[PDB]
Design a protein around this nucleic acid. Structure first.
Lengths: 340, 258, 87
RNA sequence: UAUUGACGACCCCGAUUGGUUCUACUACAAACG
């Protein structure tokens, strides 16, 4: 069957990519925009540059240059799973459990679930990433299976054309420095950026590939001694002379800019608290990871990642069972392994 | 790197400095009007545009006193070696020999790709992840191409003619140019394609100012600078320029009108 | 007397085409209409200096010797886009 | 009344600006004490 509404129709016109210069949202100004439908483009006010690795031996040669870990299966996203990708409201609330699939992309008052994020894999034990050529996928070492590695079948590597393999990776605890050059950011636009770059402890960004498998969790923090932010008044002083002159101390203002951002979110997405705003609470849970120590892995009908990888049959059991939808991210609810 | 490109980035930063000081916006002006602002009209030049002032007819156009020369790499290829790259069809296929050939490392893809590196990029769809349909593209990033020095040429004689001979009127244009070079050295001016998208940042390790028959007060320009912040130029000279610069900022007249 | 001088492009390299764009100073992006291209003679290309001087005075003028010095110094520029890379 | 039973990759560039503005003959030698 075909659902009755196309997903584009379950997204509000104010959330679709911008079609003209006057509908540029904050990221379309900060990071820039090109119209996908006609004329119109804007150079982004934010430039990332000067990325340097500090560590010389940053790359995990797993043992020999020819070694390679076979890397789970990174499958393609399938939004046909309406209980995962469709929202019962344009607030982004999940579908209700127990309803038949036809309920999915069914009414214009349905919504999309919004921006897909890969929550940090909190609580991965010591040695989880260690010695990754070893097929520890079939034992619950400290309560987790080696979820990032394709299991062996019959004792041989499953280097099929569904998975990729990697000859190495950047080790954990390796460090990169990069710089952001910003232009004409307002205090909200700047405070939003600096909030991301000054998240509290154990908030982690997700980067690169393999994010469903736990890869690419990174901590971003600012180096204040190499940061030089001034408003246009402070640049008139800088360009006022060829002699050196005092830069302002931006560290007195960083908290003010973050508050300017935070109060704007409280005011436009009406809440008594900033942290209770649903996309803020959801985003926070993504960066922080789930607290209940349940493992993060694709749905399957068995604790172990069995080698044949029949992840589809959890969805079969769910269809005949309690037809549960993907829980709201800020609710931190785990799925059962038997959705029935 | 065309000199048209190095001149447009320098002009863009020069104009941005001028507009920043005067707090003068560029959003309402069309592009020909955006270009036409003070000091840059003499340094970088202005379009020929005859205008009736009042009975008298005047060309607003003047050639740039500032001229930039195309920049070229240390790295050369035979005309067919590059055609082997332009006409490669498979990134992991025939492109690999083409780049190994053209970089001069026919047997070290690693060394070859430390010079010219193919980079794949995706746009990731915001609800699904994965990749947006069609939005897969590749850049040949010249990550390790080495370049020749950029060569700019300021016709002091041409400026002095615009300022009707007055060598005292040079100092603001010189001051602007040194401010543009301070930004260039401080990575504030990226060059070329993709500057916001992983490319275009340069490191300036030396600027050599080398004028001939300069007027006696501009002669302290004859300097090899390696500090980005111009502190290799004599402070008494940088203060003299700063004084004339500040005098102009206080009243930013059209300095070639007399 | 200055004659017309044919340009010998090295080997038989074809003319290059050079793209140009005006970048809007507000948006930082290609200004509408301001997209252009210029055919340019490569570099290394040679042409004759076709000069004849009829002297009525004796010797050769100083100003003309100075000119030939500037040519050997490479100080004279020719054609369009002299500030923007060329000539 | 809900069973049958596991396999499988996709994306490969997309949108846009493509010229804009100025100079278009000027002095002459033939006219005029």
């Amino acid at each position: 069957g075909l659902y009755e509404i196309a997903p584009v129709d379950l997204l509000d016109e104010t959330l679709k990519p911008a079609t003209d210069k006057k509908q540029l949202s904050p990221a379309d100004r900060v990071f820039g925009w090109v119209n996908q439908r006609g004329n119109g483009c804007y150079k982004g006010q934010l430039r990332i540059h000067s990325v340097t690795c500090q560590h010389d031996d940053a790359i995990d040669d797993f043992g020999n240059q020819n070694f390679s870990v076979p890397l789970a299966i990174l499958g393609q996203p399938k939004p046909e799973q309406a209980r995962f990708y469709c929202a019962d409201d344009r607030k982004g609330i999940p579908l209700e459990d127990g309803y038949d699939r036809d309920d999915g992309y069914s009414d214009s008052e349905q919504g999309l679930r919004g921006r897909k994020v890969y929550p940090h894999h909190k609580g991965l034990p010591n040695g989880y990433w260690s010695n990754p050529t070893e097929d520890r996928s079939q034992q619950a070492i400290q309560g987790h299976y080696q979820e990032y590695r394709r299991p062996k079948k019959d004792g041989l590597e499953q280097r099929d054309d569904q998975n990729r393999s990697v000859k190495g990776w950047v080790k954990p605890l390796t460090e990169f420095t990069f710089e952001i050059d910003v232009t004409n950011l307002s205090e909200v636009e700047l405070g939003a950026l600096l909030w991301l770059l000054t998240l509290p402890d154990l908030h982690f960004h997700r980067l690169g590939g393999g994010k469903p498998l736990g890869f690419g969790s990174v901590r971003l923090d600012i180096d204040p001694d190499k940061t030089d932010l001034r408003n246009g008044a402070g640049w008139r002083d800088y360009y006022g002379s060829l002699l050196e002159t005092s830069q302002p101390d931006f560290t007195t203002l960083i908290s003010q800019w973050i508050n300017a951002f935070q109060t704007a979110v409280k005011e436009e997405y009406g809440s008594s608290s900033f942290d209770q705003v649903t996309f803020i609470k959801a985003s926070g849970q993504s960066l922080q990871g789930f607290h209940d120590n349940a493992s993060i892995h694709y749905p399957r009908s068995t604790p172990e990642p069995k080698p044949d990888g029949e992840a589809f049959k959890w969805f079969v059991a769910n269809e005949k069972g309690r037809r549960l939808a993907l829980p709201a991210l800020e609710k931190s609810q785990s799925f059962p392994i038997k959705p029935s | 790197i065309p000199g048209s490109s190095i001149k447009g980035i320098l002009r863009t930063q020069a104009e941005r400095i001028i507009r920043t000081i005067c707090q003068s916006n560029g959003s309402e002006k069309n592009f020909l009007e955006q270009l036409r602002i003070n000091l840059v009209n003499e340094l970088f030049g202005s379009a020929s545009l005859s205008q009736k002032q009042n009975g008298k007819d005047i060309d607003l156009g003047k050639i740039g006193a500032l001229a930039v020369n195309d920049c070229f790499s240390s790295l050369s290829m035979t005309p067919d070696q590059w055609k082997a790259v332009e006409n490669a069809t498979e990134m992991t296929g025939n492109l690999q020999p083409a780049l190994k050939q053209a970089t001069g490392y026919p047997n070290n893809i690693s060394q070859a790709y430390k010079v010219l590196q193919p980079a794949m990029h995706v746009a990731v769809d915001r609800w699904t992840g994965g990749a947006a349909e069609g939005m897969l593209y590749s850049v040949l990033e010249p990550i390790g191409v080495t370049w020749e020095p950029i060569q700019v040429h300021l016709d002091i004689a041409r400026l002095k003619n615009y300022y009707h001979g007055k060598e005292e009127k040079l100092k603001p244009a010189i001051a602007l140019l040194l401010l543009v070079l301070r930004d260039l050295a401080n990575k504030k001016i990226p060059v070329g394609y993709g500057t916001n998208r992983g490319m275009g940042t340069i490191t300036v390790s030396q600027i050599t100012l080398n004028g001939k028959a300069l007027p006696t007060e501009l002669e302290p320009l004859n300097k090899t600078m390696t500090c980005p912040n111009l502190t290799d130029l004599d402070e008494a000279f940088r203060q003299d320029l700063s004084t004339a610069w500040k005098e102009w900022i206080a009243d930013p007249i059209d300095l070639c009108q007399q | 007397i200055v004659d017309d001088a044919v340009i010998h492009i090295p080997n038989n390299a074809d003319v290059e085409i050079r793209e140009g764009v005006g970048i809007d100073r507000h948006f930082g992006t290609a200004a509408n209409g301001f997209k252009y291209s210029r055919a340019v003679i490569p570099k290394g290309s040679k042409f004759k200096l076709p000069l004849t001087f009829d002297s009525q005075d004796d010797g050769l003028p100083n100003a003309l010797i100075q000119l030939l010095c500037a040519l050997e110094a490479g100080d004279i520029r020719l054609g369009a886009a002299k500030t923007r890379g060329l000539g």
